[PDB]
Amino acid sequence: XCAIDQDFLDAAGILENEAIDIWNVTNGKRFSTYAIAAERGSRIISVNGAAAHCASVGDIVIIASFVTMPDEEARTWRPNVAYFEGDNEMK
Amino acid sequence: XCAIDQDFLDAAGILENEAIDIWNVTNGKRFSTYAIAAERGSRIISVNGAAAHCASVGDIVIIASFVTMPDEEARTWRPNVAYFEGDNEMK
Amino acid sequence: XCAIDQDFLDAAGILENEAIDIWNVTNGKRFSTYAIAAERGSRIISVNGAAAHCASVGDIVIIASFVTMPDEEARTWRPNVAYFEGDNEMK
């Protein structure tokens, strides 16, 4: 896979080659793959490979990454959330 | 996503933003997402976003979280379990 | 399971008994199992047991393994990737 505009990766704290879960709001499909960085500013969200069977151009999806940490740190942990609208306009 | 009454999260030892598995007893669907806290005493169990394709109001579900620990600790580990009935009445 | 030519495992850095994700490019199925080593040079990719319900001889698949590491190490991490063509000819 899933090429994502590098600006999006930076905002959500997601790294290239990191595991990500993709939950499809449009068709309800949920799958896991890994992140690839796409050119900055392109606003690209490309589902490549076998994953092309789970999402179509135009589908709304939620992409998430998970990390592990000691319970004491988890208590105050805060995730990096980026919101979008229109044609991948980061609001 | 799944907003869960903070009291329920407290009883099960589940943290906000922690990854959770939801197993639908009603329809048999099994999915993973993360927990969000709902105001205490609200008794809310809300499946939002893409998750709304896997559960409906009225469905009976089991919500579980998993943690990692060394083998010795694992052998003496006791899970935090809460049982429900009726109008999400804890026992 | 999935017996994989030991040479292929070597190129991808995959270990025997290591958990692997198999993404079927042909039918779109995605499943997880563990790797078994097949004799070197055999070029075997065998889906055995319950896995045989997700892949058939002839199917094109992507086999991946994931590891965990601290954030600093993650940012400089480079995956071991092997590409194939024809009769499972590595490039």
Binding site: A3, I4, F8, A11, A12, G13, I14, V25, I36, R43, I44, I45, S46, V47, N48, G49, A50, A52, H53, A55, S56, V57, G58, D59, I60, V61, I62, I63, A64, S65, F66, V67, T68, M69, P70, D71, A74, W77, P79, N80, V81, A82, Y83, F84, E85, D87, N88 | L15, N17, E18, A19, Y34, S65, F66, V67, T68, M69, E73 | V25, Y83
Partner: peptide
């Protein structure tokens, strides 16, 4: 014990391209 937490997420992005034959 170690917890698995949400690191971050891109909420409601649109798939712009799908390439089944991708080899990279």
């Amino acid at each position: 014990m170690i917890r698995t937490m949400l690191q971050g997420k891109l909420h409601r992005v649109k798939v712009t391209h799908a390439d089944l034959h991708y080899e990279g």
